[PDB]
UniProtKB/Swiss-Prot annotation, chain C:
It comes from the Viruses. This is Spike protein S2'. Subunit of the fusion protein that is processed upon entry into the host cell. Mediates fusion of the virion and cellular membranes by functioning as a class I viral fusion protein. Contains a viral fusion peptide that is unmasked after S2 cleavage. This cleavage can occur at the cell membrane by host TMPRSS2 or during endocytosis by host CSTL. In either case, this triggers an extensive and irreversible conformational change that leads to fusion of the viral envelope with the cellular cytoplasmic membrane, releasing viral genomic RNA into the host cell cytoplasm.
Length: 99, 106, 8
């Protein structure tokens, strides 16, 4: 019945080309970046991937901002709970707010 | 400034542009090791000042992260913060004191 | 450092 906007654009010579990287391959890049971040650290971006426990990586991250290692190693569960609550808050804010 | 840990750069002119030679540092030959976040000695937790604790199976060493240069564990490169029942993954080992054997040796 | 050498 009513002509679609996409068909009205197509019938006058206005086409849209597809991107080279599909959504699954962009997601594969994102998954590779996330796995290299959480299992190796910053070493995979500056050479080969060097495996390290995540607690030692976060202790290095606190050393990067002028805080010593005992702050992490004495408050590991508190930081884990705060990170999990932050991720849940991002999830709830993305589910509710659409702006 | 180039891929890897950046060391230097050198400029060169080019027709309508510039060319940078980025001299950088890349680690080469990895090696597996067993690590611990801290060492409980005499009921006190010891953390490294700079570096990381590694072990080749029997003895523990402390070394910097970007190069395998193992050294024996002393009180000069470790600091004490609290006891050893809070940190998870902590191990039992001894820490050499650089003063007392030289004191009795005199 | 001083009390330890005072002990010795
Ligand atoms: C530092 O702040 C954290 C929260 O950011 C406090 O942890 C809370 O402590 C209260 C009472 O001890 C608990 O009811 C909460 O469940 C804790 N929150 C979390 C996320 O674990 C912590 O007590 C504060 N530290 C000090 C010394 O006040
Ligand atoms: C792990 O490192 C230690 C470092 O002390 C090695 O022990 C030395 O091994 C050499 C020969 O490989 C001996 O000549 C030394 O006397 C040893 N030192 C001590 C203090 O015993 C050890 O061989 C290494 N390898 C393992 C345990 O497989
Ligand atoms: C270390 O151990 C892992 C698991 O056995 C192995 O895949 C890897 O090749 C080893 N060597 C290095 C240098 O990572
Ligand atoms: C370390 O030694 C103490 C006392 O010597 C002991 O209570 C503790 O269980 C030991 N830790 C481990 C992991 O064996």
């Amino acid at each position: 019945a009513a002509r679609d906007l996409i068909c009205a654009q197509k019938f006058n010579g206005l086409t849209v080309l597809p991107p080279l990287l599909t959504d699954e391959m962009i997601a594969q890049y994102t998954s590779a970046l996330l796995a290299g971040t959480i299992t190796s650290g910053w070493t995979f971006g500056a050479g080969a991937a060097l495996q390290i426990p995540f607690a030692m990586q976060m202790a290095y991250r606190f050393n990067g901002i002028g805080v010593t290692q005992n702050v992490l190693y004495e408050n590991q569960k508190l930081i884990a709970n705060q990170f999990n609550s932050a991720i849940g808050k991002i999830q709830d804010s993305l589910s509710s707010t659409a702006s | 400034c180039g891929k890897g840990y950046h060391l230097m750069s050198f400029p060169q002119s080019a027709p309508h542009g510039v060319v940078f030679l980025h001299v950088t540092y890349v680690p080469a030959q990895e090696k597996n090791f067993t690590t611990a976040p801290a060492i409980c000695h005499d009921g006190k937790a010891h953390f490294p000042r700079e570096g990381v604790f590694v072990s080749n199976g029997t003895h523990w060493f402390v070394t910097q992260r970007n190069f395998y240069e193992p050294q024996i564990i002393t009180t000069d490169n470790t600091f004490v913060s609290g006891n050893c029942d809070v940190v998870i993954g902590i191990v039992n080992n001894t820490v050499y004191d650089p003063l007392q054997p030289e004191l009795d040796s005199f």
